[PDB]
Design a protein around this ligand. Structure first.
Ligand SMILES: CC(C)(C)c1ccc(-c2nc3c(N(O)O)cccc3c(=O)[nH]2)cc1
Ligand SMILES: [Zn+2]
Lengths: 161, 47
């Protein structure tokens, strides 16, 4: 597919700034942990950079279109994405299949500033049945995977809750 | 896949009732997001 995963050492400054954003954005959720589990912090086992020229040039191209339609401001953020299809996302890229059709804000790809929120979707909608091994949505054993993505928002419609 | 609101490129969900909650965002073009970092982790049991 053209994707290579480069491991980062915990002494690398990128590793540390990403882990900080991962840990500092945890919060308690109104379900008490039903979907993502009960936890105040993570144990980071590994952080890897994703490298794919086709998928990057695909992103930078759209970013330019959005920027030129919004006074040269792409409104770019770094956001979390949890999904059962992370393996397909890092190789084939985002597309319709990775959309939440039942989402509160429409049928699209959802991202979060709270890592703990994206964690609720690692095993599917509302945690699904939990980890594939123990069927435990609050498993402290099995390994999980999140994505820390570069997102272009352009002009964003504000929907108050 | 749905469309973005006319004249917009994404949707920002502002947390209202919940005070500690941060924003959530929605895009309708897979090309407006690049997966930069793949993080492998475990949730930790509170003391
Ligand atoms: C249907 C499918 C493909 C299995 C699916 C994948 C990913 C998500 C998902 N939703 C989120 C969300 N929503 O939607 O409230 C808010 C904040 C973050 C996220 C997130 O990181 N991922 C939802 C469905
Ligand atoms: Zn498990």
């Amino acid at each position: 597919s053209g994707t290579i995963l480069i491991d980062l050492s915990p002494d690398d400054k990128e590793f540390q700034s990403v882990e900080e954003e991962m840990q500092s954005t945890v919060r308690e959720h109104r379900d008490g942990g039903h979907a993502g589990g009960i936890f105040n912090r993570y144990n980071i086992l590994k952080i890897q950079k994703v490298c794919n020229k086709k998928l990057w040039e695909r992103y930078t191209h759209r970013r330019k279109e959005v920027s030129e339609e919004n006074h040269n401001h792409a409104n770019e953020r770094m956001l979390f994405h949890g999904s059962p299809f992370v393996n397909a996302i890092i190789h084939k890229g985002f597309d319709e299949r990775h959309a939440y059709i039942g989402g509160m804000f429409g049928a699209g790809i959802y991202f979060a500033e709270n890592s703990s929120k994206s964690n609720q979707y690692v095993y599917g909608i509302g945690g699904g049945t939990g980890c594939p091994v123990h069927k435990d949505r609050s498993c402290y054993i099995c390994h999980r995977q999140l994505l820390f993505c570069r997102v272009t928002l352009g002009k964003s419609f504000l929907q108050f809750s | 896949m749905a469309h973005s609101p006319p004249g917009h490129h994404s949707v920002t969900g502002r947390p209202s009732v919940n005070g500690l909650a941060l924003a959530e965002y929605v895009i309708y073009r897979g090309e407006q997001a690049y997966p930069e970092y793949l993080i492998t982790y475990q949730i930790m049991r509170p003391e």
